[PDB]
Amino acid sequence: GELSAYTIVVGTVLTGFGFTTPLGLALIGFGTLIPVLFPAQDQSNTWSDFITQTKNIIKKEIASTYISNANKILNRSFNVISTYHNHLKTWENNPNPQNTQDVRTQIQLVHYHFQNVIPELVNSCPPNPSDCDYYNILVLSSYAQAANLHLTVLNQAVKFEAYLKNNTAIDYYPVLTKAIEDYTNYCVTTYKKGLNLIKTTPDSNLDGNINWNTYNTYRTKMTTAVLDLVALFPNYDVGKYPIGVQSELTREIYQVLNFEESPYKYYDFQYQEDSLTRRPHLFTWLDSLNFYEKAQTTPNNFFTSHYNMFHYTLDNISQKSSVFGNHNVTDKLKSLGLATNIYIFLLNVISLDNKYLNDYNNISKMDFFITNGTRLLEKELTAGSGQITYDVNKNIFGLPILKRREETLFPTYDNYSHILSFIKSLSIPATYKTQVYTFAWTHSSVDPKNTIYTHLTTQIPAVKANSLGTASKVVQGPGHTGGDLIDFKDHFKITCQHSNFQQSYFIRIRYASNGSANTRAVINLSIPGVAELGMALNPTFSGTDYTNLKYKDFQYLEFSNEVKFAPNQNISLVFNRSDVYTNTTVLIDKIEFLPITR
């Protein structure tokens, strides 16, 4: 949508987990968060915008007094964060005595401000039960920013104190943890209450049908606002990540074209979902876009059909997608290729405007805004000759900037949060001339080289693999892992490229698993030319509903033997399951590398 804080706040946190210091992600991360979340101090309209925008997509109503109240309440954090931020800044470069060193008192206030303002926020809802559920999902995005700030000072407090044990001393680690757990589970819960609200509310405009586009919009906006932020919360666990962490978000989000002027909005919800989005898969990179045009030469040509060319991370085989659309046999192929480190971060599309009639509303022209890392490259893809008579529609797709601006909408080659990853299409030629498209977008924090760093913990999602056994499958993530997970049944291999240095590590796994102590799954890791690790996994949850696994359901296990990689060494990570307990489900989330030698 139109609101860059979502993508910027998320961008700062990813960048923030880069190191590990006595002032944590506060002194610096705050230098960005405060200005982004409070541009007009304690009298901003950030929360209103967040709430109004959410309410504009769900299109349900409540007295605006609830919105301004929420905005009035969360705008208190400004002063409580500003003072804390100063004493901290006042604690570093400024002398290091013991008075301005008494930051421990300031931390106490920020922790007190958040124990009260968040429950206040949630409990200041309309009387009516369900009307209260709607108010809280409508405030969820603001809730998130609050909880994150909260988690940041606690993560900082923990670091701050552990630093003072070297050459009231409160211990916030048990609390930091519970906060990571509660906030995660609440956001996800609330996020689904909204998803279920939409999927449950007939749309008068659609004559009663559930509105899929509304469902999809809410998902795209909330993923970039809440889920993306919630997926990084585990990094705040100073226990788990002592020296810093490099993580990424692998989930896809979609923007759609021709929804309103096409009939498909009257079909079943799940039907549209099935044909407009992609089933859980291993992360893919877009090699090229292939659109067929009509053989004609006369004006008003358009793209008849299309297909995508893509590949798994570090895989030298380029897979091809289905040919969406109505591919004639005498049409011309207009292709747009893409090399490694060359992405589409913004595009312009010109499609035919059927005027709500059973007439073609296809894409006839596209302007891609590509990035190669050093400059902006504009490429074009046109059906026949740009010449167009019929009325046309002009739409822009892509996501907001990833960093605070500096030097057609927002993204630049050196400042973009998402890259194009796929283009699906729903069309039944045998009956209609209309076609609805969706543009898939993945987070630009994902690495094409699966690099393993040496100066901090590297987090490599299991879906960044390029080989998946037949017994295994990729299942939908629960909502807080930042993406999907692998249902490890047999084997799967992820390929990594080491940094230009030498290092020893311990590879650690973040997984989920039911089963019992007598039916533990066993995992063997074969790193050709390097090591042979193996270990038994423990039960972590019970039941078979993996879709709604809780935060506590995922745990961490580490292999005993260590590995050493040479500079720029290409690594093969072959995972095998040898146990017989076929009924013991194991969900692989993240593969972690812990540097041993500083």
Side-chain angles (χ1 to χ4, degrees), residues 174 420 446 520:
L420 188 69
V446 185
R520 310 161 82 195

PDB file of all heavy atoms in Angstrom, residues 174 420 446 520:
ATOM      1  N   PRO A 174      14.502 -13.454  32.174  1.00  0.00           N
ATOM      2  CA  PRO A 174      13.344 -14.349  32.213  1.00  0.00           C
ATOM      3  C   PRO A 174      12.135 -13.627  31.620  1.00  0.00           C
ATOM      4  O   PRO A 174      11.256 -14.240  31.018  1.00  0.00           O
ATOM      5  CB  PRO A 174      13.186 -14.630  33.701  1.00  0.00           C
ATOM      6  CG  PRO A 174      14.599 -14.564  34.200  1.00  0.00           C
ATOM      7  CD  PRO A 174      15.104 -13.324  33.512  1.00  0.00           C
ATOM      8  N   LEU A 420      10.431  -8.696  -7.490  1.00  0.00           N
ATOM      9  CA  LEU A 420       9.439  -9.541  -8.152  1.00  0.00           C
ATOM     10  C   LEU A 420       9.896 -10.993  -8.099  1.00  0.00           C
ATOM     11  O   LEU A 420      11.075 -11.277  -8.275  1.00  0.00           O
ATOM     12  CB  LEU A 420       9.242  -9.118  -9.613  1.00  0.00           C
ATOM     13  CG  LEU A 420       8.065  -9.868 -10.244  1.00  0.00           C
ATOM     14  CD1 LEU A 420       6.775  -9.389  -9.599  1.00  0.00           C
ATOM     15  CD2 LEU A 420       8.026  -9.650 -11.743  1.00  0.00           C
ATOM     16  N   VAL A 446      16.626 -11.587   1.412  1.00  0.00           N
ATOM     17  CA  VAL A 446      17.011 -12.961   1.108  1.00  0.00           C
ATOM     18  C   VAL A 446      18.271 -12.996   0.251  1.00  0.00           C
ATOM     19  O   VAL A 446      18.409 -12.226  -0.691  1.00  0.00           O
ATOM     20  CB  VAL A 446      15.871 -13.699   0.382  1.00  0.00           C
ATOM     21  CG1 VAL A 446      16.242 -15.170   0.183  1.00  0.00           C
ATOM     22  CG2 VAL A 446      14.574 -13.559   1.183  1.00  0.00           C
ATOM     23  N   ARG A 520      12.039 -40.772  18.640  1.00  0.00           N
ATOM     24  CA  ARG A 520      12.738 -39.584  18.172  1.00  0.00           C
ATOM     25  C   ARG A 520      13.242 -39.761  16.749  1.00  0.00           C
ATOM     26  O   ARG A 520      13.754 -40.820  16.381  1.00  0.00           O
ATOM     27  CB  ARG A 520      13.928 -39.277  19.084  1.00  0.00           C
ATOM     28  CG  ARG A 520      13.598 -39.252  20.555  1.00  0.00           C
ATOM     29  CD  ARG A 520      14.858 -39.414  21.371  1.00  0.00           C
ATOM     30  NE  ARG A 520      15.592 -38.163  21.526  1.00  0.00           N
ATOM     31  CZ  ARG A 520      16.851 -38.088  21.950  1.00  0.00           C
ATOM     32  NH1 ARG A 520      17.521 -39.195  22.253  1.00  0.00           N
ATOM     33  NH2 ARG A 520      17.439 -36.908  22.087  1.00  0.00           N
TER      34      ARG A 520
END
